[PDB]
Amino acid sequence: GSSGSSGHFPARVKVEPAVDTSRIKVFGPGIEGKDVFREATTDFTVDSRPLTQVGGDHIKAHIANPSGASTECFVTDNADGTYQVEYTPFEKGLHVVEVTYDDVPIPNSPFKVAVTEGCQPSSGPSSG
């Protein structure tokens, strides 16, 4: 028996990271800011070695518009080792994308995607 404290429930403890996620590389317009124009379908690719080899379901992102709103993110694992997240920003501006692998942020985030005035998907002239 060992106890020297009463009338107090000390539940303060730090949780150590069980993942590296320090060598994660993300390439694509969705993260660079090329075809991420407003109302445009843009997506990036997350290559991870020591994190996954045959794709996984432990990825999650969150876009933050410069106004306050947020663009829904759609992560798609190619069941090969890399992740493909697609999102359509309904606002032309710099958003803050926060990535977290297994409840752990990467040394690349937060990210900054500066959208530029491009074109509109407005439906009109059809090809066939």
Swiss-Prot record:
What does the record say about PTM? ISGylation prevents ability to interact with the upstream activators of the JNK cascade and inhibits IFNA-induced JNK signaling.
* Part of the whole protein covered: 1215 to 1329 of 2602
Disease connection:
Interaction with FLNA may compensate for dysfunctional FLNA homodimer in the periventricular nodular heterotopia (PVNH) disorder.
* Organism of origin: Homo sapiens (Human)
Q: The organism's lineage?
A: Eukaryota, Metazoa, Chordata, Craniata, Vertebrata
- Relate the protein's function as given in its record: Connects cell membrane constituents to the actin cytoskeleton. May promote orthogonal branching of actin filaments and links actin filaments to membrane glycoproteins. Anchors various transmembrane proteins to the actin cytoskeleton. Interaction with FLNA may allow neuroblast migration from the ventricular zone into the cortical plate. Various interactions and localizations of isoforms affect myotube morphology and myogenesis. Isoform 6 accelerates muscle differentiation in vitro.
Record note on quaternary structure:
Homodimer. Interacts with MICALL2. Interacts with RFLNA and RFLNB. Isoform 1 interacts with FBLP1, FLNA, FLNC, GP1BA, INPPL1, ITGB1A, PSEN1 and PSEN2. Isoform 3 interacts with ITGB1A, ITGB1D, ITGB3 and ITGB6. Interacts with MYOT and MYOZ1. Interacts with HBV capsid protein. Interacts with ASB2 isoform 1; the interaction targets FLNB for proteasomal degradation.
Spell out which residues are annotated as carrying Phosphothreonine. Answer: 100
Question: Its domain of life?
Answer: Eukaryota
Query: What's in the domain note?
Result: Comprised of a NH2-terminal actin-binding domain, 24 internally homologous repeats and two hinge regions. Repeat 24 and the second hinge domain are important for dimer formation. The first hinge region prevents binding to ITGA and ITGB subunits.
Name assigned to this protein: Filamin-B
* Tissue specificity as recorded in UniProt: Ubiquitous. Isoform 1 and isoform 2 are expressed in placenta, bone marrow, brain, umbilical vein endothelial cells (HUVEC), retina and skeletal muscle. Isoform 1 is predominantly expressed in prostate, uterus, liver, thyroid, stomach, lymph node, small intestine, spleen, skeletal muscle, kidney, placenta, pancreas, heart, lung, platelets, endothelial cells, megakaryocytic and erythroleukemic cell lines. Isoform 2 is predominantly expressed in spinal cord, platelet and Daudi cells.
Give the family per the record: Belongs to the filamin family.
Q: Which residues carry this modification: Phosphoserine?
A: 109
Q: Where are the Filamin repeats?
A: 16-115
